[PDB]
Amino acid sequence: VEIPSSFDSRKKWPRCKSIATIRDQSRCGSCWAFGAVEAMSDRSCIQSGGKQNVELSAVDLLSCCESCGLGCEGGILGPAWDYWVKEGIVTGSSKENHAGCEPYPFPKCEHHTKGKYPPCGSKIYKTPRCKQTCQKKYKTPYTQDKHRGKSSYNVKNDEKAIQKEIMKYGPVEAGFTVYEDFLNYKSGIYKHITGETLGGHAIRIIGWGVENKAPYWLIANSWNEDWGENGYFRIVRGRDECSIESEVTAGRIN
Numbered sequence: 001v002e003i004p005s006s007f008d009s010r011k012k013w014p015r016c017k018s019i020a021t022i023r024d025q026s027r028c029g030s031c032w033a034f035g036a037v038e039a040m041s042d043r044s045c046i047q048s049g050g051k052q053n054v055e056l057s058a059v060d061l062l063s064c065c066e067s068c069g070l071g072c073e074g075g076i077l078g079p080a081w082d083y084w085v086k087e088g089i090v091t092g093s094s095k096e097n098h099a100g101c102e103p104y105p106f107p108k109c110e111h112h113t114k115g116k117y118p119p120c121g122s123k124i125y126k127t128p129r130c131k132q133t134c135q136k137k138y139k140t141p142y143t144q145d146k147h148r149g150k151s152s153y154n155v156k157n158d159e160k161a162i163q164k165e166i167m168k169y170g171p172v173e174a175g176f177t178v179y180e181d182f183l184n185y186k187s188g189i190y191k192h193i194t195g196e197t198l199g200g201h202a203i204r205i206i207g208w209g210v211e212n213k214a215p216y217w218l219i220a221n222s223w224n225e226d227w228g229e230n231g232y233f234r235i236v237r238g239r240d241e242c243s244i245e246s247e248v249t250a251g252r253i254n
């Protein structure tokens with residue numbers, strides 16, 4: 001297939017409203033779970049021709065997956081996608097929207113940036129319990145609200161393979177190494193220039209483009225709409241910048 005110079009999942013599949021939704025992980029190291037349920041929401045809609053148009057629950061995955069790591073203390077991508085295949089994930093929106101089976105329990109906050117929400121600060125919430133119970137107003141039992149995948153896989157560490165995967169099957173989850181200068185990002189095309197490592201982050205790659213001859217990936221962060229470019233960022237593409245091309249994981253419903 002010929003890869004276009006730019007691609008935006010939001011423009012290819014506009015009926016799938018999850019694709020253009022920015023979430024907030026709040027005071028919790030649940031990035032791994034957010035990138036997962038976001039991309040799973042997108043792909044469930046894309047791959048079902050819009051029939052499964054849902055917002056999957058970050059808290060169900062965060063609180064119930066035993067193999068995915070340490071909940072709000074951080075986690076692992078492969079097992080999150082395996083959990084979606086084997087057990088599935090229920091629906092649930094943000095705390096503020098309070099929709100679906102298990103909405104997120106934690107409020108929006110600013111992640112080392114200025115804006116209209118309280119600062120997140122340095123303390124993290126305890127991982128929520130695995131409650132297995134839909135909110136009172138939601139009239140589907142927890143087990144009957146589960147959305148499952150058929151397959152999960154790592155994507156090859158190859159730029160064209162990642163582009164082909166996104167444009168055929170939808171947004172992917174990806175890990176990268178966060179350095180201190182990432183916390184200063186306001187806009188533009190990120191690359192690591194200063195600062196020491198702060199560990200790994202997990203995000204959702206929705207497309208790609210080029211500006212002034214500089215190729216980039218277009219990425220949804222999970223730090224609310226005040227962060228970066230209305231919740232998104234761009235990062236250098238093609239050079240495995242911060243390992244962005246080396247920890248890509250996704251999956252399919254069929």
Ligand SMILES: *[C@H](CC(=O)N1C(=O)C=C(OC)[C@@H]1C)[C@H](C)NC(=O)[C@H](CC(C)C)NC(=O)[C@H](CC(C)C)OC(=O)[C@H]([C@@H](C)CC)N(C)C
Binds near residue numbers: 030070176198
């Ligand atoms: C979400 C990302 C995040 O919350 N943050 C940042 O990226 C920068 C921040 O503040 C400055 C905040 C805290 C979480 C924390 N990141 C992760 O879960 C990564 C995800 C991968 C990139 C896929 N993984 C980890 O942090 C990982 C999880 C364990 C294996 C369960 O843990 C670590 O790397 C270490 C350590 C256990 C490694 C052996 N540790 C828990 C931070």
Ligand code: NA
Binds near residue numbers: 186226228230
């Ligand atoms: Na901003």
